[PDB]
Amino acid sequence: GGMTGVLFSLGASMVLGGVAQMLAPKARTPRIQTTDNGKQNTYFSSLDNMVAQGNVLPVLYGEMRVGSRVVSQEISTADEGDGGQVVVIG
Amino acid sequence: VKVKVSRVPDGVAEYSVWELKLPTLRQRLFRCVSIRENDDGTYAITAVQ
């Protein structure tokens, strides 16, 4: 137990994947679909309304106009009324 | 050759100080540590780029 044989140095065994990978951990590209055609969406953009069923609530960090997750949509009859008494319908 | 003269040495070196000699027009080799390994034989394994 005094000695520690089999030092087993690791050099190119970790370089073999690439050198910038051992300084920066790289990024994950999304999966490409077919019905989506060629619109390569990323993981930090959403310009359409989503559905909030058993999903997570997204967060925003700066600028970059985004869509939303619809929680309630309803149509009723538009009653006549303003912020006052002027209610002419002639 | 073996002996040398330093203009102003500091009297703190005992026996085990290590001298490093730097000339001009020499590209000194820098080196950054990433992976460090321990072992019970009391030494370290450094993997660096």
UniProtKB/Swiss-Prot annotation, chain A:
Domain of life the protein comes from: Viruses
Compartment list: Host cytoplasm
Family statement drawn from the similarity comment of this UniProt entry: Belongs to the lambda-like tail tip protein I family.
Function: Plays a role in distal tail tip complex assembly. The tail tip complex is assembled successively with three tail tip proteins J, one tail tip protein I, one tail tip protein L and one tail tip protein K. The tail tip complex interacts with tail measure protein to initiate tail tube assembly. The formation of the tail tip complex is completed by the addition of tail tip protein M, which is followed by tail tube polymerization. May be excluded form tail tip during maturation and would be absent from virions.
Protein name from the UniProt record: Tail tip assembly protein I
Organism encoding this protein: Escherichia phage lambda
Native organism taxonomy: Viruses, Duplodnaviria, Heunggongvirae, Uroviricota, Caudoviricetes
Span of the entire protein shown here: 133 to 222 of 223
From Swiss-Prot, chain B:
Places the protein is found: Virion; Host cytoplasm
Coverage span on the entire protein: 542 to 590 of 1132
Species: Escherichia phage lambda (Bacteriophage lambda)
Subunit structure: Interacts with host LamB.
Function of the protein: Attaches the virion to the host receptor LamB, inducing viral DNA ejection. During tail assembly, initiates distal tail tip assembly by interacting with gpI, gpL and gpK. During virus entry to host cell, binds strongly to host LamB in an irreversible attachment. The binding induces structural changes in the tail leading to viral DNA injection through LamB trimeric pore.
Record protein name field: Tip attachment protein J
Assigned protein family: Belongs to the Caudoviricetes tip attachment protein J family.
